[PDB]
Design an enzyme around this catalytic site. Sequence first.
Site, mmCIF file in Angstrom:
data_model
loop_
_atom_site.group_PDB
_atom_site.id
_atom_site.type_symbol
_atom_site.label_atom_id
_atom_site.label_comp_id
_atom_site.label_asym_id
_atom_site.label_seq_id
_atom_site.Cartn_x
_atom_site.Cartn_y
_atom_site.Cartn_z
ATOM 1 N N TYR A 150 -2.219 30.175 -26.269
ATOM 2 C CA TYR A 150 -0.996 30.465 -25.527
ATOM 3 C C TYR A 150 0.248 29.912 -26.233
ATOM 4 C CZ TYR A 150 -4.089 31.443 -21.387
ATOM 5 O OH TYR A 150 -4.995 31.847 -20.489
ATOM 6 N N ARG B 110 7.025 40.446 -24.916
ATOM 7 C CA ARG B 110 5.877 39.784 -25.477
ATOM 8 C C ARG B 110 4.597 40.605 -25.230
ATOM 9 N NH1 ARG B 110 2.468 37.221 -21.227
ATOM 10 N NH2 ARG B 110 1.450 35.902 -22.812
HETATM 11 C C1 HEM Z 1 8.774 37.730 -14.606
HETATM 12 C C2 HEM Z 1 7.916 37.633 -15.607
HETATM 13 C C3 HEM Z 1 6.466 37.471 -15.372
HETATM 14 C C4 HEM Z 1 5.617 37.903 -14.402
HETATM 15 C C5 HEM Z 1 5.912 38.685 -13.123
HETATM 16 C C6 HEM Z 1 4.296 37.364 -14.754
HETATM 17 C C7 HEM Z 1 3.199 37.531 -13.955
HETATM 18 C C8 HEM Z 1 1.918 37.001 -14.247
HETATM 19 C C9 HEM Z 1 0.809 37.143 -13.424
HETATM 20 C C10 HEM Z 1 0.798 37.715 -12.020
HETATM 21 C C11 HEM Z 1 -0.242 36.568 -14.063
HETATM 22 C C12 HEM Z 1 -1.653 36.442 -13.570
HETATM 23 C C13 HEM Z 1 -1.830 35.120 -12.841
HETATM 24 C C14 HEM Z 1 -3.173 35.133 -12.118
HETATM 25 O O1 HEM Z 1 -4.300 34.873 -12.635
HETATM 26 O O2 HEM Z 1 -3.177 35.401 -10.924
HETATM 27 C C15 HEM Z 1 0.252 36.052 -15.303
HETATM 28 C C16 HEM Z 1 -0.522 35.438 -16.248
HETATM 29 C C17 HEM Z 1 -0.018 34.901 -17.408
HETATM 30 N N1 HEM Z 1 1.290 34.861 -17.771
HETATM 31 FE FE1 HEM Z 1 2.816 35.735 -16.851
HETATM 32 N N2 HEM Z 1 4.421 36.691 -15.903
HETATM 33 C C18 HEM Z 1 5.661 36.758 -16.388
HETATM 34 C C19 HEM Z 1 6.218 36.159 -17.525
HETATM 35 C C20 HEM Z 1 5.493 35.365 -18.384
HETATM 36 C C21 HEM Z 1 5.935 34.892 -19.659
HETATM 37 C C22 HEM Z 1 7.284 35.035 -20.187
HETATM 38 C C23 HEM Z 1 4.891 34.204 -20.275
HETATM 39 C C24 HEM Z 1 5.167 33.556 -21.563
HETATM 40 C C25 HEM Z 1 4.282 32.942 -22.204
HETATM 41 C C26 HEM Z 1 3.730 34.372 -19.407
HETATM 42 C C27 HEM Z 1 2.485 33.883 -19.652
HETATM 43 C C28 HEM Z 1 1.368 34.174 -18.895
HETATM 44 C C29 HEM Z 1 0.047 33.703 -19.344
HETATM 45 C C30 HEM Z 1 -0.236 32.922 -20.596
HETATM 46 C C31 HEM Z 1 -0.844 34.196 -18.402
HETATM 47 C C32 HEM Z 1 -2.301 34.130 -18.371
HETATM 48 C C33 HEM Z 1 -2.711 35.455 -19.110
HETATM 49 C C34 HEM Z 1 -4.037 35.583 -19.798
HETATM 50 O O3 HEM Z 1 -4.649 34.577 -20.157
HETATM 51 O O4 HEM Z 1 -4.548 36.699 -20.037
HETATM 52 N N3 HEM Z 1 4.106 35.109 -18.287
HETATM 53 N N4 HEM Z 1 1.590 36.364 -15.441
#
Ligand code: HEM
EC number: 1.14.13.238
Length: 334
Positions: free
Chosen positions: A34, A220
Amino acid sequence: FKPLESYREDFSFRNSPAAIARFPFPFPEDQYMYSVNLEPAVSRDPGSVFEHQFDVDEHYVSEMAERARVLELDPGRCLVMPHMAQAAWDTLAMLMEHLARDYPQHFRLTRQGDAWHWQNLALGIDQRFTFGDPASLPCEPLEYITRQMQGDFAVLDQRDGDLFMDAGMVTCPADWSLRFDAGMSFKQWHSPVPMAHQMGVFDRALKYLLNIQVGAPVRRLNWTLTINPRLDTSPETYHEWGNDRGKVTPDNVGRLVHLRVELQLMARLPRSNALLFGIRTYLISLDELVSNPAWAQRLHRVMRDLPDPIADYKGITRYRQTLVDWLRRFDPEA
Ligand code: HEM
Ligand code: NA
């Protein structure tokens, strides 16, 4: 647009050689970790998924049919809180403008004041409506336009130094739900994610997103894996998909396991000052992906070495050893 493909049932979805070549392979290194992996969302590489702000591809028609099916069964995958109605119109304006400008063979937009004329030739839609008037459309404006663009969308209210998930259309999620997350703040909805909070990733990422300005959007990639080309991997529908994670064998890895990549757009919406989050979701089978010998070798290394909490968070545990074994065949050094 190829013949109609399914993302459920018989799973007839497949990539052409061109769609394989432009798949957004998401690993810059032989291992994954990450990070704040944001860049300015500027047009680059013609033909690639980074050429336009909103990417429409060979699967457009298939994907909108799948969205229509999800919504037939569960209209609650789209939510707009009352205060986000202007944001929903901003979203519709931004999508229609970009689509009509970038894909003029498929979309057209003519306007005079709030009298708008939208044609979507791909789906055979010819709509005269009034911008801002929800009674002039056959449904709520977010739902109206997202039924006509690939990928998911969240629309975030920026207030009090934070972002709140107060609207969206979420029909192809990587195992999360908009009805669960409705009204949550940025750190709160990310609460299940391992490691990244302690690393500061979500602190820094919030700070960058809060400063996004009109006309300077940001992007991203995120990734995971999915068994079959199932777009609707939602909690809502878990009984339909979760057991497929038990069906992977050494002989069927290539047909079953798909790499799932989200090309994420963050763009300030100009009237409301809300932030649009586009989740453009791409799928590729491992048979298709190993076309590319470089991708195959790199995926072998990534999956072999992935930290276990990340593997587990991503839902890959039950079949990871079979997968790694299969992919090792494409890594000469191993
Ligand atoms: C408004 C912007 C964003 C929304 C609505 C969003 C939404 C989400 C949601 C709903 C999840 C899944 C969480 C779960 O397990 O329930 C998630 C996972 C994640 N998000 Fe975001 N996110 C946003 C921006 C960001 C940004 C900018 C980063 C920058 C690093 C980020 C990094 C992550 C990471 C690392 C995960 C876990 C994903 C994985 O391992 O496959 N998110 N995000
Ligand atoms: Na690095």
